[PDB]
Amino acid sequence: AAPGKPTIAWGNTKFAIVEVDQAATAYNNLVKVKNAADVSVSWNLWNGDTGTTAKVLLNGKEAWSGPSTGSSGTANFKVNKGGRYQMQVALCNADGCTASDATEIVVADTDGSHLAPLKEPLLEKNKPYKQNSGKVVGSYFVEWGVYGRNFTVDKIPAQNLTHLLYGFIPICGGNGINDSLKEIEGSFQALQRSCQGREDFKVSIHDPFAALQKAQKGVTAWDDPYKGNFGQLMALKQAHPDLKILPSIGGWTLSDPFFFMGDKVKRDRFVGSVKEFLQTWKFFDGVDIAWEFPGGKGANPNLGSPQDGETYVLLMKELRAMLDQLSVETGRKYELTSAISAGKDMIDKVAYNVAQNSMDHIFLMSYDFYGAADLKNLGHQTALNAPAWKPDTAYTTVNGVNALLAQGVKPGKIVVGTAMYGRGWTGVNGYQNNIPFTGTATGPVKGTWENGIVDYRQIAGQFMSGEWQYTYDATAEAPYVFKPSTGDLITFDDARSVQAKGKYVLDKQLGGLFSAMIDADNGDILNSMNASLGNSAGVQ
Ligand SMILES: CC(=O)N[C@@H]1[C@@H](O)[C@H](O[C@@H]2O[C@H](CO)[C@@H](O[C@@H]3O[C@H](CO)[C@@H](O[C@@H]4O[C@H](CO)[C@@H](O)[C@H](O)[C@H]4NC(C)=O)[C@H](O)[C@H]3NC(C)=O)[C@H](O)[C@H]2NC(C)=O)[C@@H](CO)O[C@@H]1O
Numbered sequence: 001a002a003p004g005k006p007t008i009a010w011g012n013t014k015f016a017i018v019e020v021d022q023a024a025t026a027y028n029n030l031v032k033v034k035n036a037a038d039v040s041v042s043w044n045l046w047n048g049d050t051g052t053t054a055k056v057l058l059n060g061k062e063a064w065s066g067p068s069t070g071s072s073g074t075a076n077f078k079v080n081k082g083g084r085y086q087m088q089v090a091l092c093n094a095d096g097c098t099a100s101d102a103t104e105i106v107v108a109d110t111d112g113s114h115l116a117p118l119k120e121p122l123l124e125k126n127k128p129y130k131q132n133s134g135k136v137v138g139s140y141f142v143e144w145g146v147y148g149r150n151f152t153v154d155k156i157p158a159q160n161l162t163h164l165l166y167g168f169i170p171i172c173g174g175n176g177i178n179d180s181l182k183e184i185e186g187s188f189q190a191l192q193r194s195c196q197g198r199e200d201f202k203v204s205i206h207d208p209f210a211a212l213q214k215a216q217k218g219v220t221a222w223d224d225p226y227k228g229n230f231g232q233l234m235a236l237k238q239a240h241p242d243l244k245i246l247p248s249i250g251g252w253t254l255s256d257p258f259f260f261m262g263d264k265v266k267r268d269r270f271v272g273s274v275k276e277f278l279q280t281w282k283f284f285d286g287v288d289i290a291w292e293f294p295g296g297k298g299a300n301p302n303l304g305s306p307q308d309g310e311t312y313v314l315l316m317k318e319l320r321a322m323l324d325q326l327s328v329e330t331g332r333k334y335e336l337t338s339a340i341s342a343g344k345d346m347i348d349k350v351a352y353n354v355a356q357n358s359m360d361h362i363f364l365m366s367y368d369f370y371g372a373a374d375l376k377n378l379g380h381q382t383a384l385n386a387p388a389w390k391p392d393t394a395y396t397t398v399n400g401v402n403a404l405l406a407q408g409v410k411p412g413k414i415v416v417g418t419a420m421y422g423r424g425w426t427g428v429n430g431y432q433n434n435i436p437f438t439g440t441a442t443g444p445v446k447g448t449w450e451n452g453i454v455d456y457r458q459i460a461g462q463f464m465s466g467e468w469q470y471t472y473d474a475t476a477e478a479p480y481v482f483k484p485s486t487g488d489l490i491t492f493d494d495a496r497s498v499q500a501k502g503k504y505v506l507d508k509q510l511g512g513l514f515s516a517m518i519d520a521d522n523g524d525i526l527n528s529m530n531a532s533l534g535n536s537a538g539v540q
Contacts, residue, residue: 005091056089059085130538135162136162165337165514173195336358366418372441385476426489
């Protein structure tokens with residue numbers, strides 16, 4: 001007779017191709033990439049003959065075979081593809097094979113193949129759009145937004161984006177390499193801990209807890225190998241396979257290391273580490289370079305060189321070459337993008353007409369034109385055009401776009417920036433003709449989280465009632481609110497100014513729109529980004 005029916009032993013059924021060390025703070029130790037997951041199964045046979053061969057099947061296909069030598073057995077084998085499997089143990093002899101009932105096992109991988117899709121309802125004022133305009137609709141999500149702001153990946157209105165950028169991936173380096181981080185309490189030290197035993201100029205993760213370990217919706221079980229932002233982003237990819245999720249390297253306070261990459265030894269090491277990063281974290285679809293900025297005038301007053309423009313173009317070329325190789329190895333398309341200054345003076349330090357051949361999208365940072373850092377010269381921080389009271393205004397969206405076009409950048413490359421926050425001043429005074437911008441300020445407006453910056457959500461929620469004046473400047477295409485008694489003045493984007501930008505993008509055949517930061521919107525801004533680019537209402 002055929003053997004008795006084996007009983008699969010109670011035991012761990014969750015395995016991982018990329019393992020995460022739960023007691024490690026250094027990125028080198030935190031993550032272990034393997035070619036395959038080490039899987040184990042045991043069984044008992046309570047009734048009958050134990051057969052002469054034991055097999056482990058995954059969805060009916062043999063993953064392991066060995067002699068059946070007793071009433072209990074154990075099998076260890078490798079599984080090299082992520083997902084969920086119906087595992088059985090079968091005992092065979094010359095008279096037949098007898099298979100156990102199936103037990104599901106989970107083999108995790110960083111493409112999120114083991115995860116249920118993270119398909120969450122739209123929150124706040126967010127309304128559903130189909131991505132059918134063919135235009136970019138992008139936004140940045142910040143790693144630390146999960147703390148005080150409590151804005152997690154499950155709160156991202158993901159169906160209303162083409163591109164989701166993760167800010168920010170740091171580049172390893174201590175004294176002289178990441179000095180800008182020292183301005184943020186504990187932040188430099190956090191990076192040094194993450195990069196312990198890791199070479200300068202390789203990428204890492206700034207806050208491994210937030211990125212990988214913090215319990216979040218859909219990734220709360222203790223033996224879920226990827227939690228935090230990355231785990232949720234993996235599940236998000238399962239829900240939105242066409243969403244481009246890009247890691248953004250740099251940003252204001254993590255940009256210092258770019259200034260050393262004129263040394264090709266360092267640049268090669270960096271590009272290599274990015275490749276490794278993408279091979280490790282498979283849910284990512286490319287890389288965004290947020291170098292602020294070639295030539296300097298970023299966070300660090302002691303960095304910036306005339307060489308930086310050349311370095312930028314070389315970096316983009318070499319990144320593209322690495323990504324092209326990754327693409328044909330994987331059969332995937334990878335994107336290369338960059339967030340850049342919108343100031344003409346800044347833009348002309350770089351030959352974007354050359355660099356564009358390496359890039360899928362240029363994220364034009366057409367915001368922060370004005371702010372609390374200058375209390376004497378006030379203006380619209382993210383306007384399309386100059387205002388009527390100062391038509392020679394240098395920093396406008398159109399001037400940034402025109403600077404790029406003048407170089408020879410193709411318009412389809414250019415993605416225009418919208419702000420999901422306001423900047424502002426307090427104590428504004430000495431202004432003429434009921435235009436507060438013509439006055440001067442005494443300090444920054446009180447901020448939502450940091451001085452001089454207000455979440456759009458709070459502007460809409462608090463500063464569009466009471467004593468607050470509201471004005472839409474139709475010449476600049478820019479709203480502002482003003483509280484005369486305290487001289488609080490806030491410049492921001494609203495649904496109408498975003499609409500003007502979208503129409504401008506369509507008229508000029510630009511690439512689309514993107515925003516910073518997604519956590520600060522109540523839905524109004526992203527709704528308008530979608531609508532104005534011609535995306536159809538409804539779900540796809
Ligand atoms: C287009 C352009 O070039 N605009 C610039 C403008 O950026 C300059 O102003 C600077 O802006 C950057 C953001 O772009 C500010 O940096 C952020 O600062 C905050 C506060 O420290 C950082 O948040 C903290 O991050 C840590 C992790 O390091 C978390 O642990 C904390 O929870 C978190 N704290 C809070 C309260 O959120 C954040 O990481 C920084 N972001 C980045 C990407 O670096 C910078 O402070 C700001 N500097 C000044 C002086 O305002 C502006 C300066 O004049 O010039 C242009 O307008």
